[PDB]
Specification:
Strand content of chain A: under 5%
Shape of chain A: elongated
Structural class of chain A: little secondary structure
Oligomer: part of a larger assembly
Radius of gyration of chain A: 22 Å
Number of helices of chain A: 0
């Protein structure tokens, strides 16, 4: 008491309610500004 | 595998959490534009 270990555990078992199941979350962050883009969609490159 | 039915079930039993219970949802769509009014509120017709 008064001395708490800062981080608590996400204990996960195959039996929880929807509010407690281990949701696998990933985030994708892009930088859509003016600079050579190394990442692009699968669109084909037509002629010029 | 790799051959999935597009559609699955709302398996409903009397005992789930509130997050899974069979809620009955009905939505009402209105078109509030200048056109002959066919559906109106219960307001009475007063004299002219």
């Amino acid at each position: 008491p008064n001395c708490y270990f800062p981080l608590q555990s996400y204990g996960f078992r195959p039996t929880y309610g929807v509010g407690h199941q281990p949701y696998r979350v990933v985030v994708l962050s892009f930088e859509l500004l003016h600079a050579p883009a190394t990442v692009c969609g699968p669109k084909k490159s037509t002629n010029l």
